Amino acid sequence: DFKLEQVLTSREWQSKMVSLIKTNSNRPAMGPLSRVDVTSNVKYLPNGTYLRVSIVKLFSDDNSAESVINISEFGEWDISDNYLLVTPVEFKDISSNQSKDFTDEQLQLITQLFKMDAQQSRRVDIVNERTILFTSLSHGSTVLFSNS
Amino acid sequence: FKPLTVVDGVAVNMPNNHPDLSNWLPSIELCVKKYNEKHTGGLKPIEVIATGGQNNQLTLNYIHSPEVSGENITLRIVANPNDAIKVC
């Protein structure tokens, strides 16, 4: 049954996600946000622990990242059938802001919202020998890939 | 997975037992075609996997062949379906 465990543990896993937000007119406590790029790297250890680092870039009008958040994570993980059950233990955020578009409170909110998605359990679907898909109960998903 | 649609000869799939994504389709068709313009031949996706819908949020996961699966990416649209067409 640990087939899924052999896949997650055999490799380090990486992803990119771009979120494009034209419902920006429905939340000013996120500010002038138009786009979010997230790059992530994760290893699931056979310990039952994982570690994750994510670079979040926030965009307003500039094709320049107005703000970059580095989120580092550690926690427990477990499997039940197709479901990967995570349990974060520490979330570290370090921010950099080279812009007046985004306030401290907006970056803090966006950090809390990425913390809310990182905490969730997810169905694991094997897409190919290098690729897996993670799906949340809220039907949001992410595709992860592995180099070697 | 189960089929939703096909666009430029790329299969757009969705999970088994997934909700009705048909209310998104024009936006999916457009966001796949606008992606293919940057991703020809070996860069062209072998499939796209859609998820989401619930709570005004669509997710498209682009799957490239396993030789070059380092190009795999998730595009998430945070727009109501009427806005979503303008986002791509």
| Spans of all domains in chain A | 3-145
Compare CB distances from A140 to B1, B59, B75 and report the shortest one's residue.
B59
List the Cα angle A24/A30/A33 in 5-degree steps.
Answer: 50
Reduced to 3 states, what is the DSSP secondary structure of residue A28? coil
Rounded CA-CA distance B88/B85 in Å is 6
DSSP A74: E
Compare CB distances from B76 to A17, A128, A147 and report the shortest one's residue.
A17
Q: Whole domain around residue B11: which residue ranges?
A: 2-87
The torsion region of residue A81 among left (phi > 0), alpha (psi -120 to 50) and beta comes to: left
**A47 — contact with chain B (CB < 8 Å)?**
no
Within 8 A of B80 by CB-CB distance, chain A residues are 23
How was this model experimentally determined? X-ray
CATH number of A3-145: 2.40.128
Q: Quote the number of domains for chain B.
A: 1
Closest residue by Cα to residue A137 from A148, A122, A126:
A122
Q: Which residues pair with B73 in a beta bridge?
A: B62
Within 8 A of B35 by CB-CB distance, chain A residues are none
Resolution in A: 3.0
Largest pairwise CA distance in chain B: 37
